[PDB]
Amino acid sequence: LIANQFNSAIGKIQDSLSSTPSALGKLQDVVNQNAQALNTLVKQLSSN
Amino acid sequence: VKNKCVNFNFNGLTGTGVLTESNKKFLPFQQFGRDIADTTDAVRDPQTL
């Protein structure tokens, strides 16, 4: 019984991550923030 | 002279780099090309268009 519950739970983790797109936002925003900040730096070259 | 690290002076535009054959589809009324940082990156030769 415990084996069946464990295997079903693992499969539910798998398809839950595969279906929901918005899971990993805690990672993604970090990259985005650095990307955004760096991009801002480049367009500070264009002000006189 | 192209594909060599040179200094160019295009109608008073001074800079340093390599000049390369482009694929930029300049419409004929245009002359220069700027980038996000407003550096010149594309230029029309005043003798050969």
Swiss-Prot record, chain B:
The molecule here is called: Spike protein S1
Instruction: Please tell me, according to the UniProt entry, what happens when changing T14K.
Output: In strain: Omicron/BA.1
According to the record's subunit comment, the protein's assembly and interactions are: Binds to host ACE2. RBD also interacts with the N-linked glycan on 'Asn-90' of ACE2. Cleavage of S generates a polybasic C-terminal sequence on S1 that binds to host Neuropilin-1 (NRP1) and Neuropilin-2 (NRP2) receptors. Interacts with host integrin alpha-5/beta-1 (ITGA5:ITGB1) and with ACE2 in complex with integrin alpha-5/beta-1 (ITGA5:ITGB1). May interact via cytoplasmic c-terminus with M protein. May interact (via N-terminus) with host bilirubin and biliverdin, thereby preventing antibody binding to the SARS-CoV-2 spike NTD via an allosteric mechanism.
Please describe what this protein does.
Answer: Attaches the virion to the cell membrane by interacting with host receptor, initiating the infection. The major receptor is host ACE2. When S2/S2' has been cleaved, binding to the receptor triggers direct fusion at the cell membrane. When S2/S2' has not been cleaved, binding to the receptor results in internalization of the virus by endocytosis using host TFRC and GRM2 and leading to fusion of the virion membrane with the host endosomal membrane. Alternatively, may use NRP1/NRP2 and integrin as entry receptors.
Positions spanned in the full protein? 534 to 582 of 1273
